[PDB]
Amino acid sequence: PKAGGPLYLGRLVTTAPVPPQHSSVHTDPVLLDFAKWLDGKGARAEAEAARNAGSSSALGLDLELPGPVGERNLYTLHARGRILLVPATESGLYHQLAAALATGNSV
Amino acid sequence: APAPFADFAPPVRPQSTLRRAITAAYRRPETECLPPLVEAATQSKEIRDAAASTARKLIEALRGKHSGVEGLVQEYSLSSQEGVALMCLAEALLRIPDTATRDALIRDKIADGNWKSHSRSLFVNAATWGLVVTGKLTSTVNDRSLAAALTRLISRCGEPVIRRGVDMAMRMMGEQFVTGETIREALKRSKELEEKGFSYSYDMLGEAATTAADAERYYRDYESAIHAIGKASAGRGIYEGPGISIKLSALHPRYSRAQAARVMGELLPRVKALALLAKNYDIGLNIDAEEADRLELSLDLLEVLCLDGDLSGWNGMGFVVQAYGKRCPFVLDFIIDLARRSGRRIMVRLVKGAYWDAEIKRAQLDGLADFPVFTRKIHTDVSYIACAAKLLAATDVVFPQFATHNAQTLAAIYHMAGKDFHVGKYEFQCLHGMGEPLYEEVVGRGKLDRPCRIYAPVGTHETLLAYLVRRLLGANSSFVHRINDPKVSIDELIADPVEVVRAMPVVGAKHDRIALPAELFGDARTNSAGLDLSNEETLASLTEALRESAAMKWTALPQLATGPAAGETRTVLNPGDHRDVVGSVTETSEEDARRAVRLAADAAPDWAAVPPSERAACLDRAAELMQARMPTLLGLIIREAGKSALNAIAEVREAIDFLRYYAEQTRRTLGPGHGPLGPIVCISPWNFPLAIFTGQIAAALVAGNPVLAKPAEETPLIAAEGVRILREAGIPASALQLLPGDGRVGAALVAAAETAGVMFTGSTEVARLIQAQLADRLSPAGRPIPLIAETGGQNAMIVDSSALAEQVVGDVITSAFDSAGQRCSALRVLCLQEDVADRILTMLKGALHELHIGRTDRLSVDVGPVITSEAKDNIEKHIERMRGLGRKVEQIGLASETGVGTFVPPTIIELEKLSDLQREVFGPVLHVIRYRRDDLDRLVDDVNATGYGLTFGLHTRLDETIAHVTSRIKAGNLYINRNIIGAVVGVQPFGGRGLSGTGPKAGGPLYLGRLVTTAPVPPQHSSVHTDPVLLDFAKWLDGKGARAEAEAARNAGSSSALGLDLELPGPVGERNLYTLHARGRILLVPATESGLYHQLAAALATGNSVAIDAASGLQASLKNLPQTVGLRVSWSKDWAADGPFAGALVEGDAERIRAVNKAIAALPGPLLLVQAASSGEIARNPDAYCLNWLVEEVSASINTAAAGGNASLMAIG
Amino acid sequence: ELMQARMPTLLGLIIREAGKSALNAIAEVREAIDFLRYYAEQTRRTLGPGHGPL
Ligand SMILES: Cc1cc2nc3c(=O)[nH]c(=O)nc-3n(C[C@H](O)[C@H](O)[C@H](O)COP(=O)(O)OP(=O)(O)OC[C@H]3O[C@@H](n4cnc5c(N)ncnc54)[C@H](O)[C@@H]3O)c2cc1C
Ligand SMILES: NC(=O)c1ccc[n+]([C@@H]2O[C@H](COP(=O)([O-])OP(=O)(O)OC[C@H]3O[C@@H](n4cnc5c(N)ncnc54)[C@H](O)[C@@H]3O)[C@@H](O)[C@H]2O)c1
Ligand SMILES: OCc1ccc2c(c1)CCO2
Ligand SMILES: [Mg+2]
Incomplete structure (x- = not known):
């Protein structure tokens, strides 16, 4: 994560905290389609994890940070890109997909 | 056969001279109201100096003893969102009845991690807690921010902060926002201040009954409270002893001028029965003042009660008058005269008024001539002082009750009233848990030796939070906000509003930042004017x-x-x-x-x-x-x-x-x-x-x-x-x-x-x-x-468990049954989250039965006929099919007088699935579906799956749900926390998609351009955003050597207005948004490679996907597309199988265009907006295909007053 | 606080050891101060018993 930014300290502990202002009201639509697919096949635990990931993802965060006058300093969270998924089990794959899709990524 | 309009709206009684003077002032220009108020409120220099000194002394006392929430935020270093989230959690924990169970859940489950693990967002009331914590009102709740903040604060501070939050919320909700949860508890807690010289008026918090059952419940709550208060009063009488305050809107579900006959026939006897009981115990019974359109109606009840001999011998009847209202002095003249005529010493509570922002919004929405309230706070202060002078001249015939927390107002009246005082001459009043610090500097021989009656709300957490937002507006102009502002000096607080107004250049000028209803659109055009059916x-x-x-x-x-x-x-x-x-x-x-x-x-x-x-x-x-x-x-x-x-x-x-x-x-x-x-x-x-x-x-x-x-x-x-x-x-x-x-x-x-x-x-x-x-x-x-x-709609409203049921029911009744459901925008399918469906449905059915159906030449008629017998037959055939399938059907009983016309009773049909509906049923027929919260996204799919896309409503307080639903629904007119029948021209440009319309929207800026051969550039119509798939296609074209087409593609990307996102001017308390989106999948019927590239550029530049006619033989022209473009491109051999499309682009000579147009018209489903051009036209005219018709307009109207107040207007004083 | 108070001395070292001009040495020390204070504040906003160190 970026130095001098709110995600940095969380990389240096074994369980990351929720950083200040770190949330988004946006839900990735492909995540939502994935959750519905999971519910269709009765993967109830995975569909719940998918919905929870969709909500707790901060993808779409878009903040203006306090700074000097005459400048606008913006901070935004986007998808990383394409995530390599190395699953072992079907449930593991569903959880990995949920995490990656909820954050806007392809896999 | 009754003559038309012979019984349209006869008044309750012939209007006396005094009543006519009230009505004449209803919307009188503010510059005309103020001069006589300034004159009446003028006092001598000696009095003004004495009042200023008293006000300074009171304010110095207040500021010298000035926190609970503030101290908690300080101790745990909480952000504002953490403070709000903590109070929401505390509220939820207090819904657990048993203390040991709550404490165990805190210790073992909440503190130790996932609070989420233990059907209703924790944050439903976060707007209210936000007001408590931050002093600012937000209309909706950022529930994801609150969830993050709650996780953060619990993980940082653990059980101790939860314990402190619970104890704080318990104190505030049980002892500060209310005097007690029950009348017995409130009476026990009143003894302490009664011993010091205060009195009490208890408010059982009933208001705005939606059903007969609600009105009965509020009645029996008032009746039981009168017994408890009267037993406790124990003969102390109406001045030293406690009283009760009631709201007429609590006692009848149709308390309005349009239903005046029912009000006098049904509401009046209920008030009389309560008053008879108050008389027997000799306690005060005060009628609280509500919206401006209920003022004059309430006078008809006051008149009957004060003239009713069964109530004689009792002076406890009280009545509030709102000094922010332009009619206030004329209402007081009427009441004083009524007191003289009846011989009843009417208790008159003078207040400023509680509904200010709502009155501004209502007058703007209704296009009325002016507001019924002042628009500058200082005008209300002058009005109050002027009305107090009138009341103080009439203490022999009325008992004035000066309700205010403003120390300047108090001091002015204290000195105006003079040195001769006895209990029963007049009193002050204040709100429990707000006014005691001031009035502890007033009551008692050691202070000003003037009594104060404490308005004491009584009720549970559920009842208190309902209208707490209104009660807290804490606005920038409010004295209680200003007393706590360090940047506001005492000299500013003791400024004399009478002398300030008198010295203004134009006495009584309207607030500069509030538009008269006619001026909502400023220089663009003059708003249409309505008519005040309460006048x-x-x-x-x-x-x-x-x-x-x-x-x-x-x-x-x-x-x-x-x-x-x-x-x-x-x-x-x-x-x-x-x-x-x-x-x-x-x-x-x-x-x-x-x-x-x-x-x-x-x-x-x-x-x-x-x-x-x-x-x-x-x-x-x-x-x-x-x-x-x-x-x-x-x-x-x-x-x-x-x-x-x-x-x-x-x-x-x-x-x-x-x-x-x-x-x-x-x-x-x-x-x-x-x-x-x-x-x-x-x-x-x-x-x-x-x-x-x-x-x-x-x-x-x-x-x-x-x-x-x-x-x-x-x-x-x-x-x-x-x-x-x-x-x-x-x-x-x-x-x-x-x-x-x-x-x-x-x-x-x-x-x-x-x-x-x-x-x-x-x-x-x-x-x-x-x-x-x-x-x-x-x-x-x-x-x-x-x-x-x-064309038609199959319009849905989705309601989650965060919505306020009474608000939902009102908007549903209006949206579904106004005009007997004969609006294209009418609500057809109400979707209720499972956890609240039964309660909302019960309320909705109760409200349904309060509707008056009949010939519409009577003001009391809510729902008129259906247009023809064939329409009636078609609607009733649908109702019977549904009933024949076992669906629950609720219908209002129709009066025999409807037999001479064609009426269908408003009908509620409970469906199993949205697929139970086939086509639009253009009548007063509401269908109700229930959904589990996790299935919200599937439900939105089901709404979209009808193929219609006209109006859509969402009732929720939760930003996450708003973002989700509004991003996924496909309809032309969206409405958040309001009814779905809004089509205000130029404010909610109206029109849908799919089976509901081709567009462009009527009352919007693309409309005229469709009626000319070359479309102009509409006002404000541009976008700085460029579709990225268009950009990828342009690069692909250049790589393929299609240089001119790549340039045209880049030009289309710039010319497209996709992404336009505007807020349209309109009334306060609403945000009206207008946005341009992709239409969907456009059918492309090209003839040449270059025509295909131009068609693709137009479609991609406007955000659409395409289905390209496979019979064109142009497959080899789109080899090696970037994956981003390929994702938007399909090839279609059977156009009818690959729809629905949202438009079409056709290239060919005249006869090819004609043949293609016939084939497109034959496609099932929506009418397609087709644009055609010849190959030569594409070569000659960069706008051969007009991008105006390749985007979809979406209007969204958000009620930003739905949380109970207007944040933007809190800064307007 | 110590780096702020000792900024002039730190500047001299940075200028001579790292080839920095005075203005960029000031920026260097300011950034170190800001990291210290920012991570301190972020810690005060976030870290609790369950966020164990690596
Ligand atoms: C005991 C008690 C009983 C009450 N009963 C009722 C009731 O039955 N009905 C009712 O409607 N209210 C009632 N109120 C009053 C209402 O709830 C507010 O408490 C009251 O208006 C606040 O005025 P204030 O003088 O204490 O303070 P202030 O800060 O002096 O006055 C604030 C008031 O100014 C007015 N105001 C604010 N901005 C503007 C503006 N731009 N233009 C014009 N006016 C403006 C509003 O009325 C606002 O409430 C009651 C109040 C008390 C204390
Ligand atoms: N999308 C909107 O803005 C909007 C607004 C209002 C009403 N509507 C829809 O209008 C419908 C109700 O109105 P209606 O009952 O008058 O509609 P309709 O379809 O019955 O009649 C509309 C008009 O078309 C005419 N008409 C009928 N057959 C025709 C034909 N074969 N060729 C040419 N014209 C023909 C009628 O005489 C009438 O003037 C509802 O479906 C409603 O949803 C849509
Ligand atoms: O908050 C004080 C208050 C008391 C009674 C009342 C209102 C406000 C509005 C209508 O009736
Ligand atoms: Mg017809």
């Missing part, structure tokens, strides 16, 4: 005008350019009573319809030659004529179309707004190069028989086209009157021909060779017939005849 003068004048309209010999004739034409003549009957003949229509022969089109064609050059500015002037003159003629137009609409007076007002206002909006849009856009299409056939529906009729015609005319106006066969008379008005305003007869008759006249007009465009509003099935007719046709240039087809 007795307006009702009396309207009654006469309505009666006079029923004596007019209304006719509708084929008005050809050559004069009226003969034809088959029949009567037009009132749908609510077929014995009431409204007028006569002569219908147009198909021969004369064709002749009219030929005359329109011959006249087209002369009308196109009238400059756009002068055409727009005709529209503006027509709007002025319609505004002046509104009362007469109302009567015709009421009797011809089954509309209530309120809905007829809206109808005429909408027509006026269309005229003025299209006039202004013309003045912004149209020039010599925007040539008219030619004769336009305007075919309109019956249900908005003036507004939509006028809108289509006005748009076509002002764009320079002569019009053939074919109104619905059910409602020709108001159409004929609209045409008469337009002709009077200067539209030549050759430019506007009226052709009454049925669908045959419409079809003959559509089929006529010189018809250059069709504007249709009506059913989807009829539009499909018109689409088929036009598929045979090409313009003389060999291009498709433009069709605007605005």
Whole structure:
């Protein structure tokens, strides 16, 4: 994560905290389609994890940070890109997909 | 057969001179109200100095002893969101009844990690807690921010912070926001301050009954409280002893002027019964003051009660008057006179007023002349002091009760009242948990030795939070906010409002930052004006005008350019009573319809030659004529179309707004190069028989086209009157021909060779017939005849467990049953989250049974008839099918008087799945579906799956749910936390997608451009955003060597207005947004490679995907597309299998275009907006395909006052 | 606080050891101060018993 930014300290502990202002009201639509697919096949635990990931993802965060006058300093969270998924089990794959899709990524 | 309007709105009683003086002041200009108030509030210099010194002493005492929430935020270093989230968690933990269970859940589960693990968002009331924590009101809740903050604070601080939050919330909700959870607890807690000289008035928190059952519950709560208060009073009497305060709106679900007869018949006896009990215990019973439109009605109840001999011997009846209201001094004159006449010493509570922001919004929405309240806070302060001077001169006949937390106000009155005091002369009043710090500096021999009665709310956490937002507005102009602001000096707080107002350059000027309703749109155009159906003068004048309209010999004739034409003549009957003949229509022969089109064609050059500015002037003159003629137009609409007076007002206002909006849009856009299409056939529906009729015609005319106006066969008379008005305003007869008759006249007009465009509003099935007719046709240039087809809806509202049930029910009743559900925008499918469905459904059914159905020439009628017996038959066949499947069906019982008309009772049908509905049922039939919260996204899919896309409503407080639902729903008009029937021209540009419309939206800025051969650039119509798939396609084109096409693609990317996102000016307390999105999947029918590339560029630049005709043989032209572009591209051999499409682009010669147009018209489902061009046209004209028609307009109207107040107006004082 | 108070001395070292101009040495020390204070504040906003160190 970026130095001098709110995600940095969380990389240096074994369980990351929720950083200040770190949330988004946006839900990735492909995540939502994935959750519905999971519910269709009765993967109830995975569909719940998918919905929870969709909500707790901060993808779409878009903040203006306090700074000097005459400048606008913006901070935004986007998808990383394409995530390599190395699953072992079907449930593991569903959880990995949920995490990656909820954050806007392809896999 | 009762005479029309003979019983329209008779007043409860003949209006006395004193009552008429009240009504005369209702909306009196503020500059006229203030001077007499300044005069009445003037005091001597010695008194003003003494009052300033007393106020300074009180304020110094207040500031010298000035926290609970603040101390918690400080101790745990909470952010504001953490503080709010903590209080929401505490609120939820307090819903666990057993203390040991709550403490165990905190210790073992909440503190130790996932609070989420233990059907209702924790944050439903976060707007209220945000007000507590931050002093600022947000209308909706950022539940994801709160969830993050709660996780963060629990993980950082653990059980200790949760414990402190719970204890704080328990103190605030059980001891501060209320005196007690029950009347017994409140009475026990009142002894301490009673011993110091305070008294109490208890508020059981009942308000705004929605059902008979609610009103009964509030009644029995008041009755039980009176017993408890009277037992505790124990003979102390009405001044030393406690009393009760009631709200009339709690005691009847239809407390309004329109239902005055039911109010006097049903509400009055209930108040009397409560008053008789208060009399027996000799306690005060005060009637709280509510919205401005209930003031004068409440006076009729006060009058009866004070004259009722059964209540004689008791002086405990009390009545609030709101000094922020322009009628206040005249109301006081009336009350003082009533006290003299009755011999009752009426207890008069003078307040400033609690509904200020709502009154501003209401007057703006209703287009009324002025506000019923002042718009500068200082004016209310002067009004209050002036009214106190009037009350203090009448202490022998009334008991003044000065309710205020403002130390300057208090000091002014304390000195005005003078040194002679006895208990019973007057008192002050304050709110529990707010006013005690001030009044502990007032009550008692050691202070000012003046009594104070504490207004004491009593009730549970559920009841308290309901209207706590209103009670806290804590606005920047509020004394209690200012006393705590360090930047506000005592000298500022003790400033004398009377002397400040007196010295202003214009005494009583309106607030500069609040628009009068007529000025909502500023320089752009004049807002239409409505009528105040709570104003007795307006009702009396309207009654006469309505009666006079029923004596007019209304006719509708084929008005050809050559004069009226003969034809088959029949009567037009009132749908609510077929014995009431409204007028006569002569219908147009198909021969004369064709002749009219030929005359329109011959006249087209002369009308196109009238400059756009002068055409727009005709529209503006027509709007002025319609505004002046509104009362007469109302009567015709009421009797011809089954509309209530309120809905007829809206109808005429909408027509006026269309005229003025299209006039202004013309003045912004149209020039010599925007040539008219030619004769336009305007075919309109019956249900908005003036507004939509006028809108289509006005748009076509002002764009320079002569019009053939074919109104619905059910409602020709108001159409004929609209045409008469337009002709009077200067539209030549050759430019506007009226052709009454049925669908045959419409079809003959559509089929006529010189018809250059069709504007249709009506059913989807009829539009499909018109689409088929036009598929045979090409313009003389060999291009498709433009069709605007605005069609039906299957409109849903989604309600989650965070919504306020009473708000939902009101919006549902209005959206589903207003006009008997005969609005295209009407709510058809209500979707209730499972956890709240039963409670909301019970409330909705209770509200349904309070509706009055009947002939609409009575103000008391809520729901009128359906338009015809065939419509009734069609609706009832649907109801019976549903009932025959076992679905639960709730219907209001109809009065026998409905037998002379065609009525369908408002009906609620509980469905199992949304697929139970086939087509739009255009009647008063609400379907109800239940959904589990996790299935919200699937539900949105189901709503979209109908293929309609007109109006859609969402009731939620939760930003995550708003973002999700609004991003996934596909409808043209979205409404958040309000009804779904809003179509304010230029504010909610109206029109849908799919089976609901082709667009462009009526009342929006793309509309006129469809009625000319070369579309202008609408005002504000641009976007800085470039579709990234378009950009990838442009790069691909360059890599393929298609250099000119790549340049055209880049140009299309820039020219596209996809991503436009505007807020449209409108009323306070609402945000009205207008956005341009992709339409969906566009069918591309290319002929050449270059044409395909241009078609693709146009479609991608506007955000669409495409289905390309596989029969074009152009597959080899799209080899090696970037994956981003390939994702948007499909190839279609069977177009009907790969739809629905959202538009089409066609390349070919004239006969190819004709053949393709026929094939497109044959596709199932939505009408497609087709644009065609030849290969040469594509080469010559960069705008061969116009990007205006490849985007989809979406209007979203958000009620930002839904949380209980207006944040933006908190800064306006 | 110590780096702020000792900024002039730190500047001299940075200028001579790292080839920095005075203005960029000031920026260097300011950034170090800001990291210290920012991570301190972020810690005060976030870290609790369950966020164990690596
Ligand atoms: C015991 C008690 C009983 C009450 N009963 C009722 C009741 O039955 N009905 C009712 O409507 N209210 C009632 N109120 C009053 C209402 O709830 C507010 O408490 C009251 O208006 C606040 O005025 P204040 O003088 O204490 O303070 P202030 O800060 O002096 O006055 C604030 C008031 O100024 C007015 N105001 C604010 N901005 C503007 C503006 N831009 N233009 C014009 N006016 C403005 C509003 O009325 C606002 O409430 C009652 C109040 C008390 C204390
Ligand atoms: N999307 C909107 O803005 C909007 C607004 C109001 C009403 N509507 C829809 O209008 C419908 C109700 O109005 P209605 O009952 O008057 O509609 P309709 O389809 O019955 O009739 C509409 C008009 O088309 C004419 N007509 C009928 N058959 C025709 C034909 N074969 N060729 C040419 N013209 C023909 C009628 O005479 C009438 O003037 C509802 O479905 C409603 O949802 C849509
Ligand atoms: O908050 C004080 C208050 C008391 C009674 C009342 C209102 C406010 C509004 C209508 O009735
Ligand atoms: Mg019809």
